Design a protein around this ligand. Structure first.
Ligand SMILES: *[C@@H]1O[C@H](CO)[C@@H](O[C@@H]2O[C@H](CO)[C@@H](O[C@@H]3O[C@H](CO[C@H]4O[C@H](CO)[C@@H](O)[C@H](O)[C@@H]4O)[C@@H](O)[C@H](O[C@H]4O[C@H](CO)[C@@H](O)[C@H](O)[C@@H]4O)[C@@H]3O)[C@H](O)[C@H]2NC(C)=O)[C@H](O)[C@H]1NC(C)=O
Ligand SMILES: *[C@@H]1O[C@H](CO[C@@H]2O[C@@H](C)[C@@H](O)[C@@H](O)[C@@H]2O)[C@@H](O[C@@H]2O[C@H](CO)[C@@H](O[C@@H]3O[C@H](CO)[C@@H](O)[C@H](O)[C@@H]3O)[C@H](O)[C@H]2NC(C)=O)[C@H](O)[C@H]1NC(C)=O
Ligand SMILES: *[C@@H]1O[C@H](CO)[C@@H](O[C@@H]2O[C@H](CO)[C@@H](O[C@@H]3O[C@H](CO)[C@@H](O)[C@H](O)[C@@H]3O)[C@H](O)[C@H]2NC(C)=O)[C@H](O)[C@H]1NC(C)=O
Ligand SMILES: *[C@@H]1O[C@H](CO)[C@@H](O[C@@H]2O[C@H](CO)[C@@H](O[C@@H]3O[C@H](CO)[C@@H](O)[C@H](O)[C@@H]3O)[C@H](O)[C@H]2NC(C)=O)[C@H](O)[C@H]1NC(C)=O
Ligand SMILES: *[C@@H]1O[C@H](CO)[C@@H](O[C@@H]2O[C@H](CO)[C@@H](O[C@@H]3O[C@H](CO)[C@@H](O)[C@H](O)[C@@H]3O)[C@H](O)[C@H]2NC(C)=O)[C@H](O)[C@H]1NC(C)=O
Ligand SMILES: *[C@@H]1O[C@H](CO)[C@@H](O[C@@H]2O[C@H](CO)[C@@H](O[C@@H]3O[C@H](CO)[C@@H](O)[C@H](O)[C@@H]3O)[C@H](O)[C@H]2NC(C)=O)[C@H](O)[C@H]1NC(C)=O
Ligand SMILES: *[C@@H]1O[C@H](CO[C@@H]2O[C@@H](C)[C@@H](O)[C@@H](O)[C@@H]2O)[C@@H](O[C@@H]2O[C@H](CO)[C@@H](O)[C@H](O)[C@H]2NC(C)=O)[C@H](O)[C@H]1NC(C)=O
Ligand SMILES: *[C@@H]1O[C@H](CO)[C@@H](O[C@@H]2O[C@H](CO)[C@@H](O)[C@H](O)[C@H]2NC(C)=O)[C@H](O)[C@H]1NC(C)=O
Ligand SMILES: *[C@@H]1O[C@H](CO)[C@@H](O[C@@H]2O[C@H](CO)[C@@H](O)[C@H](O)[C@H]2NC(C)=O)[C@H](O)[C@H]1NC(C)=O
Ligand SMILES: *[C@@H]1O[C@H](CO)[C@@H](O[C@@H]2O[C@H](CO)[C@@H](O)[C@H](O)[C@H]2NC(C)=O)[C@H](O)[C@H]1NC(C)=O
Ligand SMILES: *[C@@H]1O[C@H](CO)[C@@H](O[C@@H]2O[C@H](CO)[C@@H](O)[C@H](O)[C@H]2NC(C)=O)[C@H](O)[C@H]1NC(C)=O
Ligand SMILES: *[C@@H]1O[C@H](CO)[C@@H](O[C@@H]2O[C@H](CO)[C@@H](O)[C@H](O)[C@H]2NC(C)=O)[C@H](O)[C@H]1NC(C)=O
Ligand SMILES: *[C@@H]1O[C@H](CO[C@@H]2O[C@@H](C)[C@@H](O)[C@@H](O)[C@@H]2O)[C@@H](O)[C@H](O)[C@H]1NC(C)=O
Ligand SMILES: *[C@@H]1O[C@H](CO[C@@H]2O[C@@H](C)[C@@H](O)[C@@H](O)[C@@H]2O)[C@@H](O)[C@H](O)[C@H]1NC(C)=O
Ligand code: NAG
Ligand code: NAG
Ligand code: NAG
Ligand code: NAG
Ligand code: NAG
Ligand code: NAG
Length: 1224
């Protein structure tokens, strides 16, 4: 049955869900089964769960669970109900240090006494329905019981050994479970019905929406819900947008755990975490670990989170409703999510125990995340920080037992990575890792999809920085000095025991001070004794001696004095004559202050120079003659003589000269700019200045290198740039000069080729007509509504006023121009629908839009055409133009502002477009109906074939209007229209867009995309400027006025006022450029529609390029018109001999009146019968000549054909020989 058992996992009726854990293994499917249903007592080891499925009224039931080591100290379990009283027969249950019953019995053969120690020795009612299933599972010291509810109990245990006694119940009474299993619930109704449980394989684990299969590279697989995966911040959370941020999303191992189980686990930031990873595990030590949980009740237990620091300090996670652990108890007396819970960290160390306040716990904790460097986030916020973590222990307590295992609560080991994240409604929906060079380029911009084009790129530098340090500078000459000392003493006198005189000097002076870095002392000994010699000895009462100082003694100041000297240590000298007078010389003093300015040296080193050092041809940091930088130093073989360092005219260092050797070394950048040809959502080639890169082929273009994976010629350039083009396959090549359509130069004689076999092609061209008007509330944009800032802005006079006036004047001028342009005729509109139109042979179903009764306020509306549908839906990012938000609700303030209201709060209001797509399509339909309207009334609806025939006759008089002649043009036009429609439908498929370039569909759609993106880009660029702090103390005016005094604050806010005003002016200037450019576009469009659509043009090449223009039809397009100029292209040429004229009887010269008419001889009778035909030079329409087409000239010329009077009527059938007729 099992319906009642699975009904306990309370789940919503219409939800299909996945079950995991030690569940019943069924009866028939898989190995599983093993339903005993007998008193055979199978003793088993290593079992993790047991189940009983059918209670045949009241049959008995005996269970004994014990440790396999049979430990008497450990706790055993024995449950026994050998009674059939149902409700009144409560089962005797004992979780105790209990008799370890080996086989069977209430007491039985065993160890341990009955009641030496018990945790539970009461009786429990064990009555239930026949189909009710009871089960008990033990794992990780946690026990789950299925007695009508998912009861959970933490209990240290090791319960591998089981012994049983069953009683017969339907052949499926009792069974064991060794390993976890999985199930699928097709729940369709509440209660025990509408459950439809089935067993599962591993795939069902992947079915849960909150778990995923980790990629081998660690990337998050696509399509993940990210239902609770918040982005991690310290300060504030973005509500909507895209962010390139460093977040711990590089997942290594994912541990999906069913909600009904708690968890006792140990995690180390230094070792790969254990457990069965769902996807491809990566053996990398975690630096962050993220817990995704449904309900808060898991964490409320004290000690659930224990953080271990490298210092050994422990942080225990505690919660209560109280804010004073030191002044109150935290044993929880309340539950059921009542009252917000203050949650702290208690610090555990045997010096002083303190509590660190985490936060008021939010009502719904969904993900916690702890990470090394000492950081913890709850619901993606930086609540608290600590020192370097090294280990965590997780002690989690199941779930709320009211909606369980509708999936799995999951723990993820993650490493930090720079990723692009798209977030809406403060919830992540998609992510992109910034490791692939293609992904690196994507993250360089801010977008997930990138249009085809050449993008700037940085040359890949060294993976390991390890940059050596370079330093070049010629130093000063190492000046030396000799500090003389000379003592002059004439002693002895009489008998040698007397004195005569004594004196001493340093450098001929009574005092001296050392200046050079290197000094050497030298002492000299005038002692002249009248009796003989004198022994001289040196005393010392200083931390140094005259002999010691020379070695390496260093000072900041050193002065020698023969007399009193400030702060000077004393040194004396003794002179003993031959009989020992024993008198000192003059006392000597050193004033010394320690320092590196000077140093005592035993020998001078004059000539010693140079301390520079550098590394050649290695990307290194350098300090060259005061220029600090980072680059590559390379010995260059130039021969500069003057100068020591060389810089460009812009002040940039280029080369420096080793003065000692004369060599010169150039300094180049470590990395060079490159171009990536991002087409077809891939990097197909790189234009680089380097010799080689990570591509299979490299081609040496005249100006640069091109590295790609396709060395073949690029005959079909998908993306053209400068002098080159790149195909979709990565090939590069020069664009071949396409040969234009040949035009026959008119002439009077010789051969002439007349075009024929005309094929009716169509060429497309898009022309923008208007831009969306934008009003900028300058005052509130700059001052953010601050009155003081407005008063300061008043000092800037009329810049703001001019900005606003220019914007509004441009908007009004554009509006009035486009409004006066659009003229719509209702009679033409009547003929503009499929039912009214009769395009015999011409297939306008793609061009005409259907018109049906609109339930929206009754008024009838005409749906836009299929071509217009394709052009709008697939291009417009919002799908429809009505998506333009209204500011009516923007000031409501009851909801969090979106992007439109975000920019409106800055004073930017985007007025609706001047003309909606509905009116534009109406105008296009009016033009289409007008080109077939043959009169002032609707009854004059000329068939399109007649109109085409008239327009053809306009440029060349048709001589034989064959039905097949018109049918060929009709079918060619239909084929071209179908091809254009297919090209619009999709890119490079079902219509090969290999034929690409100007005047094609692809160019038009690229222009439309650029048009629809430019305005949004400009608006976002304007809005982001508010974030910038323009060299002020902050980007908030109120913050500046708070932290600063009024004097300095005015100076400070004046900095951003100029910055915002300058940024605002830049936006206005670029919009005026856009307005000026589009103005010329609509002037061309107005000229185009008048001279091409409403009437055929004699201006060759004006309407849709070269060729003979027959007509042109307009379709609506985003902020513009798409002209389809239909043009005739010749397919064959008839070669004829032009007749310059006739000279008949050598006396009458007769020529053709019409300059655009040629007289010739063709076909079999060009020379056999010498028959003449006149035809238009534009189209081959041979016709017999007429007397009205000829004029007489006063003189013949040699180029004219000889003729006689009798022969002329053969040439001219309409001629009447008046002399012959009158004389007969
Ligand atoms: C919320 O606010 C907290 C407050 O600190 C921020 O916590 C900091 O997080 C950053 C990482 O985001 C920590 O920086 C890490 O330092 C590690 C050790 O530092 C040494 O190495 C760096 C780099 O050589 C030296 O500059 C530094 O002086 C030390 O010598 C680094 O090894 C880490 O590098 C890792 O990331 C880089 C990418 O940036 C990889 O290339 C590396 O291979 C490596 O995987 C890292 O930079 C910082 O220590 C944390 N603060 C403190 C006080 O410890 C949170 O980041 C912030 N939240 C968000 C979302 O930003
Ligand atoms: C999960 O459950 C839904 C709900 O259907 C219910 O559960 C099933 C297990 C069956 O017991 C159903 O009888 C029960 O109502 C399943 O949706 C059901 O799918 C089946 C086919 O897979 C649908 O049958 C089809 O119905 C159409 C329209 O009547 C017929 O033309 C077909 O020939 C075929 O009979 C059934 O209509 C549909 N239930 C409803 C209410 O529309 C679902 O398949 C199942 N599994 C999953 C993965 O969702
Ligand atoms: C993991 O969390 C669980 C539950 O939060 C912890 O189990 C709990 O441990 C405390 C500490 O002894 C127990 O308190 C004691 O309860 C008994 C009654 O059973 C009482 O007589 C004692 O005076 C004392 O208050 C608590 O009962 C116990 N909870 C359960 C359900 O058994 C466990 O210690 C935590 N483990 C780690 C490693 O943090
Ligand atoms: C755990 O996840 C579940 C969803 O997987 C969420 O709780 C459940 O939310 C639904 C819809 O809000 C509740 O449905 C209805 O709730 C009432 C409450 O009395 C119930 O009586 C109705 O029959 C109906 O099922 C569902 O009860 C609820 N589950 C609970 C409360 O256990 C939520 O994301 C998480 N639940 C908690 C308590 O955090
Ligand atoms: C700039 O040019 C000068 C001039 O060549 C370079 O000086 C050179 O420096 C090296 C390293 O000190 C000298 O090598 C010598 O080796 C012998 C044997 O080990 C040792 O006894 C010397 O004391 C010295 O180290 C080399 O002779 C010397 N060249 C000379 C003196 O002409 C210098 O390295 C260049 N680069 C700079 C300054 O960055
Ligand atoms: C176009 O104009 C040229 C000259 O103005 C016409 O000349 C034709 O040229 C072809 C090619 O040489 C001649 O065919 C062969 O000529 C050679 C040399 O004269 C000779 O062996 C044969 O007579 C042979 O047919 C052709 O005779 C010559 N015809 C005339 C009237 O000059 C040419 O007819 C004009 N039309 C076309 C379609 O080229
Ligand atoms: C057409 O006639 C002109 C006029 O010349 C007269 O008619 C000729 C049929 C012949 O009888 C001439 O003697 C007549 O004077 C021709 O022009 C002459 O062409 C030749 C050919 O080389 C030339 O030598 C003469 O100078 C031309 N006479 C002029 C220019 O007065 C012409 O050749 C005749 N044929 C064609 C096809 O035009
Ligand atoms: C801080 O926590 C660590 C746990 O990581 C404690 O180390 C434990 O000490 C007990 C001593 O009774 C040992 O039985 C455990 O084996 C130790 N744990 C580990 C993982 O080895 C440490 O004593 C705690 N210190 C303080 C001051 O609370
Ligand atoms: C007094 O100072 C002079 C000045 O240098 C010292 O003379 C030097 O003596 C050394 C020792 O041989 C010579 O190598 C130098 O060439 C001498 N230099 C000069 C400029 O003469 C002298 O030694 C010091 N002492 C006395 C007693 O004169
Ligand atoms: C050029 O680069 C490609 C890219 O791997 C190398 O092989 C290509 O492999 C794909 C996939 O098997 C094939 O479809 C292509 O036909 C292969 N060639 C090309 C040019 O893409 C190739 O080994 C590289 N080196 C060369 C062609 O010399
Ligand atoms: C393909 O691209 C190459 C590279 O520019 C072109 O180079 C030609 O190579 C041939 C073979 O030696 C030379 O004879 C030509 O002089 C080269 N021309 C140029 C402009 O470089 C080549 O023309 C292109 N087309 C083909 C079919 O190889
Ligand atoms: C005329 O052009 C229309 C285009 O609207 C063609 O009609 C569509 O043909 C496709 C063929 O795959 C059908 O799937 C559509 O249901 C047709 N109707 C539409 C798109 O409205 C038509 O085949 C062309 N030729 C005619 C009418 O002779
Ligand atoms: C801490 O880790 C050191 C580095 O060894 C490896 O570290 C990470 C990257 C894992 O791959 C881990 O399995 C390796 O051991 C060890 O040298 C050091 O012994 C480790 N310290 C402790 C206490 O385990
Ligand atoms: C925290 O929650 C307590 C709820 O428990 C109830 O009150 C205690 C005193 C016991 O009597 C217990 O049996 C009750 O169910 C509140 O009483 C307590 O005031 C709360 N703490 C604070 C600071 O408000
Ligand atoms: C259980 O036994 C008592 C004693 O005879 C009796 O009164 C009671 O009705 C019984 N309960 C059931 C459910 O049979
Ligand atoms: C207590 O502080 C002293 C400070 O010298 C330190 O040496 C000692 O290890 C600390 N004791 C503990 C248990 O942290
Ligand atoms: C000391 O030596 C100096 C060296 O110049 C000499 O001139 C002088 O006569 C000597 N005797 C005395 C007493 O100075
Ligand atoms: C010095 O000149 C030679 C001339 O053959 C040249 O090959 C060499 O590259 C030059 N040195 C450097 C560093 O370029
Ligand atoms: C094309 O022109 C040739 C001669 O110029 C003619 O014979 C043919 O009928 C025309 N049409 C087609 C379809 O070839
Ligand atoms: C596209 O043009 C070719 C050549 O004119 C024609 O054969 C083909 O039928 C056209 N495609 C469609 C869909 O009409």
């Amino acid at each position: 049955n099992f319906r009642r058992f699975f009904s306990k996992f309370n789940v919503q009726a219409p939800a299909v869900v996945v079950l995991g854990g030690y569940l019943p293994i069924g009866e028939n499917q898989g190995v599983n089964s093993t339903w005993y249903c007998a008193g055979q007592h199978p003793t088993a080891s290593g079992v993790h769960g047991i189940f009983v499925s059918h209670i045949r009224g009241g049959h008995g039931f005996e269970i004994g669970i014990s440790q396999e080591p049979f430990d008497p100290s450990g706790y055993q379990l024995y449950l026994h109900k050998a009674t059939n009283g149902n409700t009144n027969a409560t089962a005797r249950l004992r979780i105790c240090q209990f008799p370890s019953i080996k086989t069977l019995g209430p007491t039985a053969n065993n160890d341990v006494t009955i009641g030496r120690n018990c945790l539970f020795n009461k009786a429990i009612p064990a009555h239930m329905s026949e189909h009710s299933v009871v089960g008990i599972t033990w794992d990780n010291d946690r026990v789950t019981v299925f007695s009508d509810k998912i009861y959970y109990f933490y209990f240290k245990n090791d319960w591998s050994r089981v012994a049983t006694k069953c009683y017969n119940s339907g052949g499926c009474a009792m069974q064991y479970v060794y390993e976890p299993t999985y199930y699928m619930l097709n729940v369709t109704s509440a209660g025990e019905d509408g459950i439809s449980y089935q067993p599962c394989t591993a795939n069902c684990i992947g079915y849960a929406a909150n778990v995923f299969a980790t990629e081998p590279n660690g990337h998050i697989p696509e399509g993940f819900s990210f239902n609770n995966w918040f982005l991690l911040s310290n300060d504030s959370t973005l509500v909507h947008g895209k962010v390139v941020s460093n977040q711990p999303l590089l997942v290594n191992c994912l541990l999906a755990i069913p909600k009904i189980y708690g968890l006792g686990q140990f995690f180390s930031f230094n070792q790969t975490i254990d457990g069965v990873c769902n996807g491809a595990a990566v053996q990398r030590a975690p630096e962050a670990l993220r817990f995704n949980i449904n309900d808060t009740s898991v964490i409320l237990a004290e000690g659930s989170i224990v953080l271990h620091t490298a210092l050994g300090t422990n942080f225990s996670f505690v919660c209560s409703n109280s804010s004073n652990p030191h002044l109150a108890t935290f044993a929880i007396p309340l539950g059921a999510t009542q009252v917000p819970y203050y949650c702290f960290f208690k610090v555990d160390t045997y010096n002083s125990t303190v509590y660190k306040f985490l936060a008021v716990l939010p009502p719904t904790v969904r993900e916690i995340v702890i990470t090394k460097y000492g950081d913890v986030y709850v619901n993606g916020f930086g609540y608290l920080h600590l020192g370097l973590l090294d280990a965590v222990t997780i002690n989690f307590t199941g779930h709320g037992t009211d909606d369980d295992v509708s999936g799995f609560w999951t723990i993820a080991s993650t490493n930090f990575v720079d990723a692009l994240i798209e977030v809406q409604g403060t919830a992540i929906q998609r992510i992109l890792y910034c490791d692939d060079p293609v992904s690196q380029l994507k993250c360089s911009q801010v977008a997930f999809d990138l249009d085809d084009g050449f993008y700037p790129f940085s040359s890949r530098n060294l993976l390991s920085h390890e940059q050596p340090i370079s330093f070049v500078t010629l130093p000063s000459f190492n000046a030396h000095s000799f500090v003389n000392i000379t003592v002059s003493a004439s002693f002895g006198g009489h008998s040698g025991a007397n004195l005569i005189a004594s004196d001493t000097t340093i450098n001929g002076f009574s005092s001296f001070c050392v200046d050079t870095r290197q000094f050497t002392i030298s002492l000299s000994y005038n002692v002249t004794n009248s009796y003989g010699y004198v022994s001289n000895s040196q005393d010392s009462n200083c931390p140094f001696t005259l002999q010691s100082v020379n070695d390496y003694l260093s000072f900041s100041k050193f002065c020698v004095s023969t007399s009193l000297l400030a702060s000077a240590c004393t040194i004396d000298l003794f002179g003993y004559p031959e009989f020992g007078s024993g008198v000192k010389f003059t006392s000597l003093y050193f004033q010394f202050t320690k320092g590196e300015l000077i140093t005592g040296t035993p020998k001078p080193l004059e000539g010693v120079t140079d301390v520079s050092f550098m590394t050649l041809d290695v990307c290194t940091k350098y300090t060259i003659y005061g220029f600090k930088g980072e680059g590559i130093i390379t010995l260059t073989n130039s021969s500069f003589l003057a100068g020591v360092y060389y810089t460009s005219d812009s002040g940039q260092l280029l080369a420096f000269k080793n003065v000692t050797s004369g060599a010169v070394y150039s300094v180049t950048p470590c990395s060079f700019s490159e171009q990536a040809a991002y087409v077809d959502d891939d990097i197909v080639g790189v234009i680089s200045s380097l010799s080689s890169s990570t591509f299979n082929s490299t081609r040496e273009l005249p100006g640069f290198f091109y590295h790609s994976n396709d060395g073949s010629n690029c005959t079909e350039p998908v993306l053209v740039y400068s002098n080159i083009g790149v195909c979709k396959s990565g090939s590069i090549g020069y664009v071949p000069s396409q040969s234009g359509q040949v035009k026959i130069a008119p002439t009077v004689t010789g051969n002439i080729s007349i075009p024929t076999n005309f094929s009716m092609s169509i060429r497309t061209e898009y022309l923008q007509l208007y831009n969306t008007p934008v009003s900028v509330d300058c005052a509130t944009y700059v001052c953010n509504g601050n009155s003081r800032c407005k008063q300061l802005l008043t000092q800037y006079t009329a810049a703001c006023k001019t900005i606003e006036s220019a914007l509004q004047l441009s908007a009004r001028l554009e509006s009035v121009e486009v409004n006066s342009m659009l003229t719509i005729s209702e009679e033409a509109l009547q003929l503009a629908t499929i039912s009214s139109f009769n395009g015999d042979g011409y297939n306008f179903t793609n061009v005409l839009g259907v018109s049906v009764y609109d339930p929206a306020r009754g008024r009838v509306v005409q749906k836009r055409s299929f071509i217009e549908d394709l052009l709008f839906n697939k291009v417009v990012t919002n799908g429809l133009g009505t998506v333009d938000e209204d500011y009516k609700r923007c000031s409501n303030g009851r909801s969090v502002a979106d992007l439109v209201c975000a920019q409106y709060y800055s004073g930017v209001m985007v007025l609706p477009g001047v003309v909606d797509a509905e009116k534009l399509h109406m105008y296009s339909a009016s033009l289409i109906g007008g080109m077939v309207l043959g009169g002032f009334t609707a009854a004059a609806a000329l068939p399109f074939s007649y109109a085409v025939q008239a327009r053809l006759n306009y440029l060349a008089l048709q001589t034989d209007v064959l039905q097949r002649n018109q049918q060929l043009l009709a079918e060619s036009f239909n084929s071209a229209i179908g091809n254009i429609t297919s090209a619009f439908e999709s890119v490079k498929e079902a219509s090969s867009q290999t034929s690409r370039g100007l005047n094609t569909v692809a160019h038009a759609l690229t222009k439309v995309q650029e048009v629809v993106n430019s305005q949004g880009a400009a608006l976002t660029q304007l809005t982001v400027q508010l974030q910038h702090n323009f060299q002020a103390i902050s980007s908030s005016i109120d913050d500046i006025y708070s932290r600063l005094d009024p004097p300095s604050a005015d100076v400070q806010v004046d900095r951003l006022i100029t910055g915002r005003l300058s940024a605002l002016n830049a936006f206005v200037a670029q919009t005026l450029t856009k307005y000026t450019e589009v103005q010329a576009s609509r002037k061309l469009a107005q000229q185009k529609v008048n001279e091409c659509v409403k009437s055929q043009s004699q201006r060759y090449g004006f309407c849709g390029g070269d060729g003979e223009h027959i007509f042109s039809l307009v379709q609506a397009a985003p902020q513009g018109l798409l002209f389809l100029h239909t043009v005739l292209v010749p397919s064959d040429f008839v070669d004829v001999i032009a007749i310059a004229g006739l000279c008949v009887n050598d006396e009458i010269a007769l020529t053709l009146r019409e300059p655009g008419l040629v007289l010739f001889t063709h076909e079999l009778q060009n020379h056999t019968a010498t028959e003449y035909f006149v035809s238009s030079r534009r189209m081959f329409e041979p016709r017999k000549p007429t007397v009205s087409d000829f004029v007489q000239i006063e003189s013949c010329v040699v180029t004219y054909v000889n003729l006689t009077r009798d022969q002329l009527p053969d040439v001219i059938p309409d001629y009447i020989d008046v002399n012959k007729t009158r004389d007969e």
